[PDB]
Amino acid sequence: VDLTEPIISRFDILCVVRDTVDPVQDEMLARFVVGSHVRHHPSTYGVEPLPQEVLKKYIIYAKERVHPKLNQMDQDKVAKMYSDLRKESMATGSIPITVRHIESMIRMAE
Amino acid sequence: CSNTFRILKSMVVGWVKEITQYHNIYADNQVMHFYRWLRSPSSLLHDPALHRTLHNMMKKLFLQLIAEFKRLGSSVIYANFNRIILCTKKRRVEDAIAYVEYITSSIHSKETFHSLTISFSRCWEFLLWMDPSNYGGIKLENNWNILQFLPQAASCQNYFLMIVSAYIVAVYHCMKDGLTFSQDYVANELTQSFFTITQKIQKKVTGSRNSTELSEMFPVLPGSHLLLNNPALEFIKYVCKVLSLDTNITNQVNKLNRDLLRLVDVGEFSEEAQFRDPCRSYV
Secondary structure, X not given: XXXXXXXXXXXXXXXXXXXXXXXXXXXHHHHHHHHHHHHOOOOOOOOOOOOHHHHHHHXXXXXXXXXXXXXXXXXXXXXXXXXXXXXXXXXXXXXXOHHHHHHXXXXXHO | OHHHHHHXXXXXXXXXXXXXXXOOOHHHHHHHHHHHHOOOOOOOOOHHHHHHHHHHHHHHHHXXXXXXXXXXXXXXXXXOOOOEEEEOOOXXXXXXXXXXXXXXXXXXHHHHOOOOOOOOOOOOOEEEEOOOOEEEEEOOEEEEHHHHHOOOXXXXXXXXXXXXXXXXXXXXXXXXXXXXXXXXXXXXXXXXXXXXXXXXXXXXXXXXXXXXXXXXXXXXXXXXXXXXXOHHHHHHHHHHHHHHHOOOXXXXXXXXXXXXXXXXXXXXXXXXXXXXXXXXXXX
């Protein structure tokens, strides 16, 4: 990645995307891309999305009218998870700096 | 000073050579007198140095004997200066063991100037083993030292025996009919039965009016140290321990752990959910 630990560890979520070849998945992706191109002419989902206007209203409502509280999250489970996550990371190449990943999990639960 | 060590070898070679194969009784009784005399701490004549020398050399000899099993297809389950356990083929146990036992014993003796004093073949024809702390097998023998630490209240000991024996019997039936995958079948059968059994012992033991505290329910042996508290949980833990070690296919056992700990409403990853050996074994 060429980034350092102080800047990597500040990112709560790390995402890796790879354009590896898989002909069935390539067929599905290409059919969807062509479908988007013909759909949006000027003129893995399986659930259907919300309309984007509804999503904007939903987000702006949820960020102000809702404030999730934390009262119990199975403390020993998270602590054990974080500890052996640190153990495995010590042998390999990504960096769960001590509290930032714990707090990342708390933030993601919220 | 090494001449004394070589003279001990000379004396031992003398008495064992004096077996005088027409007959001897003194030489035999005193060859075994070496065996007890280099063990007994009441022995004298700069004794701890000689006991230490025996142990340090016998470590290398025993390691040679156990290690050189490698060249013939075989697996070792247990090894002690007296007791050893081996496996080579899934059929015709005596003929299967004959080639490895006699070839290895002979070449043990040739390489080590003598090691041919071996005996074998006593009834362990199908065995799940972790020493008499934990074993079970069909010749159905059950020897689980941890079972003694479960209470007899609500028949928890009997239910341990029931689940373990049923699992062994079902897998053994599959093996005999074949003569791996049946692990999953018995796992589903246990997914039903283990649920029912945990409910049975839970409702019966919690309703027992003689319980001043459920910690008082447990038996105490000289190895007992744990704060055993909630018999269905200890039963689950011990059963799942043996089930998680008698197959590498632990996935359904782990699922049973999750399901039954949630059925007891006690959390996984907690200290109380972790297995610990109920016995402070001391030798």
